[PDB]
UniProtKB/Swiss-Prot annotation, chain B:
It comes from Candida albicans (strain SC5314 / ATCC MYA-2876). This is Small ribosomal subunit protein eS31. Zn(2+) binds at residues 42, 47, 62, 65. Component of the ribosome, a large ribonucleoprotein complex responsible for the synthesis of proteins in the cell. The small ribosomal subunit (SSU) binds messenger RNAs (mRNAs) and translates the encoded message by selecting cognate aminoacyl-transfer RNA (tRNA) molecules. The large subunit (LSU) contains the ribosomal catalytic site termed the peptidyl transferase center (PTC), which catalyzes the formation of peptide bonds, thereby polymerizing the amino acids delivered by tRNAs into a polypeptide chain. There is a cross-link at residue 1 (Glycyl lysine isopeptide (Gly-Lys) (interchain with K-? in acceptor proteins)).
Length: 57, 70
RNA sequence: CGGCACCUUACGAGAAAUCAAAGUCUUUGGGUUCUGGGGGGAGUAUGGUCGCAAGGCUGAAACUUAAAGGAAUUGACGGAAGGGCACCACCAGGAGUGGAGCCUGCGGCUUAAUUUGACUCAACACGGGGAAACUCACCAGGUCCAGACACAAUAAGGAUUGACAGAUUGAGAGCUCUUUCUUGAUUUUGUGGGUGGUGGUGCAUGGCCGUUCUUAGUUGGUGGAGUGAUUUGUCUGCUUAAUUGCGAUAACGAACGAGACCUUAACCUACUAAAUAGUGCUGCUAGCAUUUGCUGGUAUAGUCACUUCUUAGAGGGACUAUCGAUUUCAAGUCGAUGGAAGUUUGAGGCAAUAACAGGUCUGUGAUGCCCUUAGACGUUCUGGGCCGCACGCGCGCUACACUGACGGAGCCAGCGAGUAUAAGCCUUGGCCGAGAGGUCUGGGAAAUCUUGUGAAACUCCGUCGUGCUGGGGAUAGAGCAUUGUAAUUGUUGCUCUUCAACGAGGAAUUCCUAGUAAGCGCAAGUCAUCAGCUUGCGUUGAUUACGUCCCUGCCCUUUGUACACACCG
């Protein structure tokens, strides 16, 4: 989160502006790259073709 | 609101301030140049020439500096 | 066949609640009687009529008024029901507070001024608000423009800037005066226009903070429901700190909050390194004993070794692990075994949506508007006030004694902070004085020195011996110092003397569940001086629960409402 707050000096008074941006953690370099509760279990490469007693050499 | 700060009263008169004495050619009342012819030039080295004095109640004083004696 | 009814749906109806009639009614017409035409005045007056009477029937107008009313929605509230939760609630206790003296804040009275904000929690040791000057905004008095800029007047025959002697002043402010010595266009006078303001407005605002609310709550897309406001999702049941999960389901998939997260406390003889940490060995030593031992000292060269202790980075470690039982066998829950750790491991930072006319214009060169701006509400100088004291209240400190006061002796932590041409920082050692304190050196910009901060409670051995007494240390005099330009209204420190209330505190009321309460100091902020204050830290270390909705409240559902400024209605 990055916040910038400014005082806009209008004719009738002062207006205040706040701008928050939640940047995506992927573009974060020098820090965490995901939310704490973000979990990244991946897929599987278990499937394959087999045969009982092979020994190739 | 701080009891609405009021007018304030005066026990002294408004002091008219100081005015500069507009003289008429003081050079023409120092120097005395008649046919074919001035107090003291401030003995201090701060000026050399160009300083005059006004004598009153035993006072010889300098203005562009301040020496005085007797 | 006739009845009294009932159940489902919504054909169709309706403003909806609901209705098999309240349907077949803008696609308006089966027959017929009665009634209503905004709310009141008013079913009143009057006349008639019936009645024994009480009264009944018939039945106006003047005048008054912008709504009254119906059904439903969301919220709020209930001395309505059900289900949960909390030491800012109770239970059971502890320490108390409220009673005393004093410190300190608020009010009131006083005053020249006793500046001002805040008033239930969410004002009252709060404004980091411990004010001698400054601070400072208040009071009495004196100066300066530091009024940029454009014009206009003026002016080098001087616009004006200053400063000697006396007067003057609180004053060695040429502030103002007899006095003209100096300056030369930088400036005085006027308009317009600025500038500053702890002046007003926090009910015109920004930002910040506090609170609702430390609870579990909040929201849209698409779908379903409803004419609509709205609703479902967001829930019967169980479970949890928790809208958090198991699940249930006109929803489905999501989002914020919660949880995760981050900081810190606890464990690691398992990696990595310590001349700013330590332990050893080995030199050179000392007291005892002489067995080579027991106690220590020194060597940042001994060109010694290492990392239990300490430090800090890289990690590991709890996941309720194993086991025994109950639970929709599901999420969980209770016990054991293992363990440093089994309440979310303990403690915190962070923290949704909607709000409050909560506080702050006195933090701000953050601000709109109003005011003021030269005899100034700008600023500065001297002095005083914020401390004034019949009185009421809050946060506190010290006490009322023997579980105690003293007097010697034992001398055990942890969090931190520190400067050099100062206007001086932490200050060690040496030397003086009873002490406060003074002086000469030294170390430290700091794991290096202050510092092992040898803190205080606490332990021992003695004096006191039940009493306002060696309890308690107000008030007051004398004296010695320290900081500061200035201690009078005692700044504070030390010595002698004075020895006041108070013998455990009424009705009331606050805080708290384990290394917690209570006790006890210590450091840091304020700071020239001053801590009975806060923010932290450690030392000693408990009784009592480990439950409940009686009180004060909070959350969810149902229900009623003539409330919505929301029952302080």
């Amino acid at each position: 989160i990055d916040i910038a707050i400014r005082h806009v000096l209008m004719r009738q008074g002062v207006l205040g502006i706040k701008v928050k941006i939640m940047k995506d953690p992927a573009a974060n370099r020098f820090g965490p790259r995901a939310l704490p509760d973000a979990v990244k279990i991946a897929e599987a490469k278990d499937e394959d073709e087999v045969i009982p007693a092979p020994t190739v050499k | 609101g701080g009891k609405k700060r009021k007018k304030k009263v005066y026990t002294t008169p408004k002091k008219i301030k100081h005015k500069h004495r507009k003289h008429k050619l003081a050079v023409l009342t120092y120097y005395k140049v008649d046919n074919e012819g001035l107090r003291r030039e401030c003995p201090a080295p701060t000026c050399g020439a160009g300083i005059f004095m006004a004598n009153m109640k035993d006072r010889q004083y300098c203005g562009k500096c301040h020496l005085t004696l007797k």
